[PDB]
Design a protein around this ligand. Structure first.
Ligand SMILES: OC[C@H]1O[C@H](O[C@@H]2[C@@H](O)[C@H](O[C@@H]3[C@@H](O)[C@H](O[C@@H]4[C@@H](O)[C@@H](O)O[C@H](CO)[C@H]4O)O[C@H](CO)[C@H]3O)O[C@H](CO)[C@H]2O)[C@H](O)[C@@H](O)[C@@H]1O
Length: 362
């Protein structure tokens, strides 16, 4: 893999605003945090602070509407941000870059229309994704040009898919409507993911309690079988609830990890009581099972297909809605949407190019 590969950025947004691009991350060779310019040259961040201090302006001019621009991506792991009209405000902590946190009303970027893609380019190739784990906002498609010349892309919404997602969220009772951040003139900016919905109080900690209690009941009397390694189908852990705790035993008979009854933040964020540091792979499987609400219906996890996902009346509706509106049915609606390979990521071992397309607000 060469030192850099070209990233073609195409503006199909139909919007008149100028685009600012940021390529922010960590340089492979040095492990330093910083930014890369259009040439692919790396610029380490200056020293940050506690409290965090302002980052220098790392923007690259993005493509005008109907045109594309190319930047070189070095071996680097990070994000390509793009913002419409306004420049983003980044700050630097002791340990480096602070990521935006627009669930906070006071975040400097709360009112800015922006999104990002996540990528890693290294000696083993390119991984590049479309993600909705934090929010659903300005739409985009990512792609790779593979060694053999073939292309792969993902992240593209169906026609009407952008407004379709908001309209579906607004009509979902229980607090999902309060995920939507709407401008003064009624223009939608973004919808927060449900993890941040729990944080902001849009959704209660208890929103999944009834389903979770049904799962814990079911697996008090019968086994939950988790086979968490896709390439090792014979490796199984057996889960059973006793004393209110879901305990997993390995083939040797040892209890290897245990789960307390999870809450909404744990499920939606794939963290806390569902932390995924042998526990990690098991937790990952359970996380996807709770978000897709398949644990009750299918005691042999993970699911072998998507047919039974999101059928419960209370489920991760944000993830359900986004998947339903994606052209290829794939999305990153929650952190472990990669379970069963349903995530909007593409990769190649010998890339030579990538793409980011700013999509229309349709
Ligand atoms: O509860 C949250 C849980 O997940 C968190 O965030 C995930 C985050 O890991 C993520 O990162 C993507 C990577 O999965 C992907 O990694 C590639 C691997 O698949 C591997 O095989 O090789 C290559 C090269 O080493 C890796 O790059 O790389 C992509 C780059 O496109 C990453 O974006 O994306 C999802 C969705 O945004 C996040 O939700 C968090 O990291 C964990 O701490 C948490 O436990």
């Amino acid at each position: 893999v060469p030192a850099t590969i070209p990233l073609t950025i195409t503006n199909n947004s139909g919007r008149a605003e100028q685009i600012h691009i940021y390529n922010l991350g960590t340089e492979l060779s040095s492990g330093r945090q910083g930014w890369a310019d259009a040439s692919g040259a790396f610029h380490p961040w200056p020293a940050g602070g506690n409290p965090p201090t302002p980052a220098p302006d790392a923007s690259i001019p993005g493509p005008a509407p109907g045109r594309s621009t190319t930047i070189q991506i070095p071996k680097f792991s990070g994000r390509i941000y793009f913002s419409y009209g306004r420049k983003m405000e980044f700050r630097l902590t002791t340990g480096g870059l602070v990521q935006p946190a627009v669930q906070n009303p006071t975040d400097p970027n709360r009112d800015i229309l922006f999104n990002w893609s996540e990528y890693t380019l290294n000696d083993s190739g390119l991984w590049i994704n479309s993600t909705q784990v934090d929010m659903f906002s300005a739409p985009y498609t990512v792609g790779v040009r593979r060694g053999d010349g073939t292309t792969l892309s993902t992240g593209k919404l169906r026609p009407g898919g952008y407004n379709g997602v908001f309209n579906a969220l607004r009509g979902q009772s229980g607090g999902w409507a309060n995920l939507i951040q709407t401008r003064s003139d009624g223009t939608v900016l973004r919808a927060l993911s449900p993890l941040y919905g729990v944080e902001t109080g849009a959704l209660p900690a208890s929103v999944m309690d009834d389903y979770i209690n049904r799962v814990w009941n079911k697996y008090t009397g019968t086994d939950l079988i988790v086979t968490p390694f896709a390439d090792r189908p014979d490796v199984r852990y057996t889960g059973r609830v006793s004393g209110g705790v879901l305990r997993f035993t390995d083939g040797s008979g040892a209890v290897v990890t245990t789960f307390q009854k999870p809450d909404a933040s744990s499920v939606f964020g794939c963290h806390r009581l569902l932390d995924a540091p042998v526990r990690g792979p098991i937790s990952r499987t359970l996380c996807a099972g709770f978000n897709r609400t398949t644990l009750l219906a299918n005691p042999h996890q993970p699911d072998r297909s998507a047919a039974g996902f999101y059928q419960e009346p209370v489920t991760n509706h944000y993830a359900r809605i986004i998947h339903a509106h994606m052209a290829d049915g794939k999305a990153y609606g929650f952190a472990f949407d990669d379970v069963g390979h349903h995530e909007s990521l593409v990769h190649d071992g010998d890339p030579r190019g990538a793409s980011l397309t700013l999509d229309p607000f349709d």
